[PDB]
Scaffold this motif. Sequence first.
Motif, PDB file in Angstrom:
ATOM      1  N   UNK A   1       0.806  -1.206   0.000  1.00 51.26           N
ATOM      2  CA  UNK A   1       0.000   0.000   0.000  1.00 51.26           C
ATOM      3  C   UNK A   1       0.844   1.263   0.000  1.00 51.26           C
ATOM      4  N   UNK A   2       0.740   2.041  -1.073  1.00 52.45           N
ATOM      5  CA  UNK A   2       1.424   3.321  -1.159  1.00 52.45           C
ATOM      6  C   UNK A   2       0.389   4.426  -1.151  1.00 52.45           C
ATOM      7  N   UNK A   3       0.553   5.460  -0.326  1.00 50.50           N
ATOM      8  CA  UNK A   3      -0.386   6.586  -0.378  1.00 50.50           C
ATOM      9  C   UNK A   3      -0.405   7.214  -1.762  1.00 50.50           C
ATOM     10  N   UNK A   4      -1.557   7.745  -2.130  1.00 55.14           N
ATOM     11  CA  UNK A   4      -1.675   8.446  -3.397  1.00 55.14           C
ATOM     12  C   UNK A   4      -0.580   9.507  -3.503  1.00 55.14           C
ATOM     13  N   UNK A   5       0.137   9.589  -4.633  1.00 56.55           N
ATOM     14  CA  UNK A   5       1.216  10.578  -4.749  1.00 56.55           C
ATOM     15  C   UNK A   5       0.669  11.990  -4.861  1.00 56.55           C
ATOM     16  N   UNK A   6       0.161  12.526  -3.745  1.00 56.22           N
ATOM     17  CA  UNK A   6      -0.430  13.857  -3.744  1.00 56.22           C
ATOM     18  C   UNK A   6       0.562  14.880  -4.274  1.00 56.22           C
ATOM     19  N   UNK A   7       0.094  15.733  -5.175  1.00 54.64           N
ATOM     20  CA  UNK A   7       0.920  16.790  -5.701  1.00 54.64           C
ATOM     21  C   UNK A   7       1.773  16.417  -6.888  1.00 54.64           C
ATOM     22  N   UNK A   8       1.723  15.161  -7.351  1.00 54.95           N
ATOM     23  CA  UNK A   8       2.487  14.789  -8.541  1.00 54.95           C
ATOM     24  C   UNK A   8       2.188  15.722  -9.717  1.00 54.95           C
ATOM     25  N   UNK A   9       0.951  16.260  -9.811  1.00 56.48           N
ATOM     26  CA  UNK A   9       0.592  17.129 -10.934  1.00 56.48           C
ATOM     27  C   UNK A   9       1.543  18.306 -11.073  1.00 56.48           C
ATOM     28  N   UNK A  10       2.185  18.720  -9.984  1.00 58.51           N
ATOM     29  CA  UNK A  10       3.092  19.855 -10.006  1.00 58.51           C
ATOM     30  C   UNK A  10       4.545  19.426 -10.118  1.00 58.51           C
ATOM     31  N   UNK A  11       4.806  18.140 -10.333  1.00 63.58           N
ATOM     32  CA  UNK A  11       6.178  17.688 -10.486  1.00 63.58           C
ATOM     33  C   UNK A  11       6.699  18.017 -11.883  1.00 63.58           C
ATOM     34  N   UNK A  12       7.934  17.610 -12.153  1.00 61.87           N
ATOM     35  CA  UNK A  12       8.538  17.896 -13.445  1.00 61.87           C
ATOM     36  C   UNK A  12       7.944  17.004 -14.529  1.00 61.87           C
ATOM     37  N   UNK A  13       7.550  17.626 -15.638  1.00 62.46           N
ATOM     38  CA  UNK A  13       7.038  16.911 -16.811  1.00 62.46           C
ATOM     39  C   UNK A  13       8.201  16.285 -17.585  1.00 62.46           C
ATOM     40  N   UNK A  14       8.208  14.956 -17.706  1.00 63.82           N
ATOM     41  CA  UNK A  14       9.321  14.240 -18.347  1.00 63.82           C
ATOM     42  C   UNK A  14       9.131  14.147 -19.858  1.00 63.82           C
ATOM     43  N   UNK A  15       7.965  13.662 -20.275  1.00 66.76           N
ATOM     44  CA  UNK A  15       7.622  13.477 -21.682  1.00 66.76           C
ATOM     45  C   UNK A  15       6.125  13.223 -21.774  1.00 66.76           C
ATOM     46  N   UNK A  16       5.626  13.219 -23.010  1.00 67.87           N
ATOM     47  CA  UNK A  16       4.253  12.848 -23.309  1.00 67.87           C
ATOM     48  C   UNK A  16       4.262  11.913 -24.507  1.00 67.87           C
ATOM     49  N   UNK A  17       3.175  11.209 -24.671  1.00 63.20           N
ATOM     50  CA  UNK A  17       3.023  10.291 -25.771  1.00 63.20           C
ATOM     51  C   UNK A  17       1.589   9.809 -25.899  1.00 63.20           C
ATOM     52  N   UNK A  18       1.054   9.741 -27.109  1.00 63.43           N
ATOM     53  CA  UNK A  18      -0.275   9.193 -27.345  1.00 63.43           C
ATOM     54  C   UNK A  18      -0.131   7.794 -27.920  1.00 63.43           C
ATOM     55  N   UNK A  19      -0.833   6.839 -27.326  1.00 60.41           N
ATOM     56  CA  UNK A  19      -0.937   5.487 -27.858  1.00 60.41           C
ATOM     57  C   UNK A  19      -2.292   5.399 -28.538  1.00 60.41           C
ATOM     58  N   UNK A  20      -2.266   5.145 -29.827  1.00 60.06           N
ATOM     59  CA  UNK A  20      -3.435   5.051 -30.677  1.00 60.06           C
ATOM     60  C   UNK A  20      -3.921   3.613 -30.906  1.00 60.06           C
ATOM     61  N   UNK A  21      -5.183   3.447 -31.289  1.00 57.44           N
ATOM     62  CA  UNK A  21      -5.693   2.102 -31.593  1.00 57.44           C
ATOM     63  C   UNK A  21      -4.755   1.311 -32.497  1.00 57.44           C
ATOM     64  N   UNK A  22      -4.578   0.033 -32.169  1.00 52.61           N
ATOM     65  CA  UNK A  22      -3.649  -0.828 -32.848  1.00 52.61           C
ATOM     66  C   UNK A  22      -2.331  -0.986 -32.119  1.00 52.61           C
ATOM     67  N   UNK A  23      -1.950   0.002 -31.323  1.00 50.68           N
ATOM     68  CA  UNK A  23      -0.735  -0.117 -30.534  1.00 50.68           C
ATOM     69  C   UNK A  23      -0.834  -1.327 -29.610  1.00 50.68           C
ATOM     70  N   UNK A  24       0.248  -2.090 -29.436  1.00 49.89           N
ATOM     71  CA  UNK A  24       0.176  -3.257 -28.540  1.00 49.89           C
ATOM     72  C   UNK A  24      -0.219  -2.900 -27.119  1.00 49.89           C
ATOM     73  N   UNK A  25       0.012  -1.660 -26.689  1.00 49.58           N
ATOM     74  CA  UNK A  25      -0.355  -1.206 -25.356  1.00 49.58           C
ATOM     75  C   UNK A  25      -1.654  -0.403 -25.350  1.00 49.58           C
ATOM     76  N   UNK A  26      -2.403  -0.400 -26.455  1.00 50.38           N
ATOM     77  CA  UNK A  26      -3.609   0.420 -26.499  1.00 50.38           C
ATOM     78  C   UNK A  26      -4.659  -0.070 -25.510  1.00 50.38           C
TER      79      UNK A  26
END
Lengths: 135, 135
Positions: A1-26
């Motif tokens: 059990x880990x507490x919800x990472x409160x405040x992560x929204x204000x942490x450093x943005x590392x990267x972004x990525x969109x996974x679209x239909x057909x992607x093995x991780x979609x």
Amino acid sequence: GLPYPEGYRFWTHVKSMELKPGHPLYESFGGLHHIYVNPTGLRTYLEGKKAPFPKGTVIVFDLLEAKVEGNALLEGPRKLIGVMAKDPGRYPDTGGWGYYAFGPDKKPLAIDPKACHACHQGAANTDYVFSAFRP
Amino acid sequence: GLPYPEGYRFWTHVKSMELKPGHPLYESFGGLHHIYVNPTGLRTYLEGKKAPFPKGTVIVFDLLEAKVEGNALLEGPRKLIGVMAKDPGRYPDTGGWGYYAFGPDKKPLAIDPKACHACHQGAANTDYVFSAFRP
Ligand code: HEC
Ligand code: HEC
């Protein structure tokens, strides 16, 4: 059990990525996701993940619905967050990483952390973290 | 002349959005962009932009190429950053906002700040800022 990472929204943005239909991780992670890292883990990213992330690192995989409207990709509702928390002594069987997930309501989701780590073992060379910090 | 907003990459991530071909803003801002706000401006976003942003606010529009590969949208090379810096006494003719732009090499780009503000006047109700903080 880990507490919800409160405040992560204000942490450093590392990267972004969109996974679209057909992607093995979609089916598991389809949509637009943003990765965030707390201060403890940021320097390891900035140096290229050539050393292990320190204990106290927390990384959050923030998964949002991807909405296509009017020649734009828009952020839709949150689907889930994935969380990796570094503690070598606490998680010896998953490479020192605690794998957790939370829904949009911040409540824990039932996951198999061994299954998270199984795929992340593909990134064992960079301490089980796939994403690279994008300048 | 505004110095390059060094360290904006580590500021708070406000929202993201991809502008696709055909969008009226595709020729000027086409691609995937992320908006960031410095600590001074963050609270105004969190409260819904019902009051004006304080002097010292800096907001950065970070524009990246949008790469579509293998059922994914990937972050491509940086195209430019747009910057809005709040100083009511310094910028009285553009609503207290200093509009600036920088290339990937961090060098200033020649812009018409009056033309930036002309479009942003559409958001005069929220102190000339379009984006909303996405929880
Ligand atoms: C392969 C089948 C995976 C499974 C199972 C899990 N994850 Fe994963 N994860 C995967 C990839 C390819 C990436 C990189 C995404 C990118 O934008 O580059 C990630 C990323 C994460 C992260 C961010 C840190 C990182 O490794 O880059 C976290 C915090 C994360 N994933 C959490 C997580 C959890 C909790 C999982 C089980 C519920 C899980 N992942 C499984 C691929 C795969
Ligand atoms: C309409 C024709 C615009 C012109 C001219 C300029 N900008 Fe703008 N800007 C526009 C929109 C619709 C948005 C919102 C994007 C979103 O994801 O919601 C923005 C945003 C910015 C921001 C972020 C703050 C905000 O207002 O939301 C900045 C810092 C910014 N733009 C800078 C900027 C500069 C420097 C411009 C002249 C070179 C400029 N904008 C022109 C629309 C339009």
